[PDB]
Design a protein around this ligand. Structure first.
Ligand SMILES: C[C@H](C[C@@H]1CC[C@@H](O)[C@H](O)[C@H]1O)[C@@H]1CC[C@@H](C)/C=C/CC/C=C/C(=O)[C@H](C)[C@@H]2CC[C@@H](C)[C@@](O)(O2)C(=O)C(=O)N2CCCC[C@H]2C(=O)O1
Length: 128
């Protein structure tokens, strides 16, 4: 399925080249511009654990998830991955625990040492 495919066929987008964050572009976005550090980014996403269980979805809330890029407001894999996206892009990210919640996990849903799968749609990004 999709998690296996990004694991085996994804692009390492880490600066360290440690395969901690792998990406596949699923729907190509607009033009060439990607968000910059500090931009307000609007996304939709769903997340799955490696046991197949969905742990979250913004779609189910009928509102986007909003954060400021590159500020550690989200897990490292998201700051790294969303920074590579074009407006309108949909991607798959595979996030090893060192770029996610590590040994701590995130109670109640995310166990220790969890590799996470996300589908992310970059809806918009704005500075100012
Ligand atoms: C929980 C996490 C905490 C954050 C991690 C980085 C670290 O440097 C920060 O100190 C720490 O606060 C952060 C919240 C997003 C920041 C921006 C939100 C904080 C407000 C408090 C409530 C947040 C939520 O309910 C999240 C939507 C919820 C929390 C539990 C997670 C397992 C999850 O369901 O989100 C989830 O899907 C997830 O894993 N997220 C949300 C989407 C972005 C990626 C990821 C995430 O980084 O969420």
């Amino acid at each position: 399925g999709a998690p296996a495919t990004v694991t085996e066929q994804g692009e390492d987008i880490t600066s360290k080249k440690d395969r901690g964050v792998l990406k596949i572009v699923k729907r190509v976005g607009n033009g060439e511009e990607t968000p910059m550090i500090g931009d307000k980014v609007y996304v939709h996403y769903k997340g799955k654990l490696s046991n197949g269980k969905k742990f979250d979805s913004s779609h189910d809330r009928n509102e986007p998830f909003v954060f400021s890029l590159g500020k550690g407001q989200v897990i490292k894999a998201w700051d790294i991955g969303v920074a590579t996206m074009k407006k309108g892009e949909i991607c798959h990210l595979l996030c090893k625990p060192e770029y996610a919640y590590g040994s701590a996990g995130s109670l109640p849903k995310i166990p220790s040492n969890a590799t996470l799968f996300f589908e992310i749609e970059l809806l918009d990004f704005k500075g100012e």
